[PDB]
Design an enzyme around this catalytic site. Structure first.
Site, mmCIF file in Angstrom:
data_model
loop_
_atom_site.group_PDB
_atom_site.id
_atom_site.type_symbol
_atom_site.label_atom_id
_atom_site.label_comp_id
_atom_site.label_asym_id
_atom_site.label_seq_id
_atom_site.Cartn_x
_atom_site.Cartn_y
_atom_site.Cartn_z
ATOM 1 C CG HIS A 75 0.030 0.059 2.496
ATOM 2 N ND1 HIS A 75 0.607 1.229 2.939
ATOM 3 C CD2 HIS A 75 0.480 -0.918 3.319
ATOM 4 C CE1 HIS A 75 1.350 0.981 3.998
ATOM 5 N NE2 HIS A 75 1.287 -0.313 4.256
ATOM 6 C CD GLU A 129 2.170 -5.757 8.057
ATOM 7 O OE1 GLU A 129 2.169 -6.991 7.824
ATOM 8 O OE2 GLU A 129 2.975 -4.937 7.526
#
Lengths: 269, 269
Positions: free
Chosen positions: B11, B97
């Site tokens: 990202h 994550e």
């Protein structure tokens, strides 16, 4: 100051490489398609200075093979003479393709057939990374020579960084060699001490006084496939965790580098 | 037919990522710099269809995080509506994550100081790939979920290829998670069989009937640093040797893919 990188590039397509043949010391030219292929590469990697800025390039290393040297010219076409004068190009024999020996020119299928007829691979299939090539190199021999390249390159990188300079070094070489190179860059395979006469000696593989020779205590070689894919014209980006030249790393590089002030990395330790 | 690829993209920049902080479940947005960062990336990856052709994209998987989703939209701006209708985007909780637990939001130096004050890391320094996070995930827990996502991805790859289709799938996720993903893609770390209740069950991490669930026999997790570098907006290219989906590989990808008739790879076996 930017994190140094060693940017590895496989030479453009040759006739044998297109057909699946093992090309080692045979000194093939780029095919026409290969040329266009590397012309478009250079264009694309230099476009607007976002992936590679020629100001940040210190050294370009090249395998002695024709195909690799041709690729250097073609990839560096978008540079100005001013830009090219600031960059040192070093021919390094340590950078050649795995010496295929008996297998030079052959196809995998053929290699297996040849070995089988010789009584080899009776218990497990041939595996170049473990076994090497009859009358060519073992995995240790290529591990060794690539390790001296790597150590030379890392040493330049450390000096440059310590001088406050950014440093992008390029390597143009081969399919087996570069996959090998990148594998050991980031720690695959095994550490072996330098013991034998070969393992210790200065074989003088390049001739450039501004590249210090690194005398190795030990070196790396693989014992198995690292599982890299690398087509002709393929590029790998090798580098460092936490700006620390002691933590070599393979970069999953996007199309452009972030300035250190914009980078997104956790701190070390 | 073209070799399928799983193309992983971290990202864009967030406020925490820029500053070295561990960002797990915290749902930060992209910084303005991050946005621009991923707008330019999308443009650069779709530029002239040479690296990525929208025609060939079948699936785009994304972590549920805002930052990852934002990046999907930004990278895909170059597409037409017709192009975007032929692509499925799948939100996958298995792609989040690492759960940092107690360390959420902290810096590495801070993590070490906190752990030391708790009597931890008495014999060797903290290593998240081995150790995981206090009240967050173990390495085995993230190994597991990542392995499920990979298995589903490689599954689709095989099906599409066997149907004679090219297949590029994209994955937009995180720094630790993607490095981890790439690491197991090509064989790093250790195989462990699925034994405990968590290790066997369907956690229902995404909701899309067109993605077959893959019930794993065993799975992979790391025990150490794989040594990848991955900035915000970094991209890795995962793939296969010899067009065999049984031989997953990391690709050192140049700016453009060669047609199989032009590719330069040795035969298998």
């Amino acid at each position: 100051s930017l994190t140094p990188r060693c940017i590895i590039v496989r030479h453009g397509q040759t006739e044998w490489s297109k057909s699946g043949q093992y090309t080692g010391l045979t000194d093939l030219p780029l095919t026409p398609y290969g040329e266009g292929q590397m012309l478009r590469t250079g264009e694309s990697v230099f476009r607007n200075n976002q992936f590679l800025n020629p100001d940040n390039i210190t050294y370009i290393f090249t395998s002695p093979r024709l195909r690799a040297r041709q690729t250097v010219d073609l990839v560096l076409k978008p540079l100005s003479d001013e830009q090219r004068a600031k960059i040192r190009v070093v021919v390094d024999d340590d950078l050649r393709e795995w010496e295929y020996g008996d297998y030079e020119g052959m196809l995998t299928r053929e290699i297996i057939e040849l070995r089988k007829s010789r009584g080899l691979d009776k218990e497990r299939p041939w595996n170049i990374w473990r076994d090497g090539c009859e009358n060519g190199e073992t995995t240790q021999q290529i591990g060794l020579r690539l390790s001296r390249a790597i150590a030379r390159i890392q040493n330049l990188h450390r000096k440059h960084q310590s001088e406050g300079r950014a440093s992008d070094i390029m390597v143009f070489a081969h399919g087996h060699a570069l996959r090998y190179f990148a594998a050991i860059w980031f720690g695959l395979g095994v550490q072996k001490k330098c013991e034998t006469i070969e393992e210790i000696q200065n074989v003088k593989s390049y001739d450039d006084d501004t590249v210090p020779y690194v005398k190795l205590e030990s070196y790396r070689h693989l014992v198995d496939n690292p599982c890299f894919l690398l087509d002709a014209g393929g590029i790998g980006v090798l580098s460092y965790a936490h700006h620390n030249i002691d933590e070599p790393a393979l970069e999953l590089a996007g199309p452009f580098v972030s300035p250190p002030e914009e980078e997104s990395q956790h701190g070390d330790v």
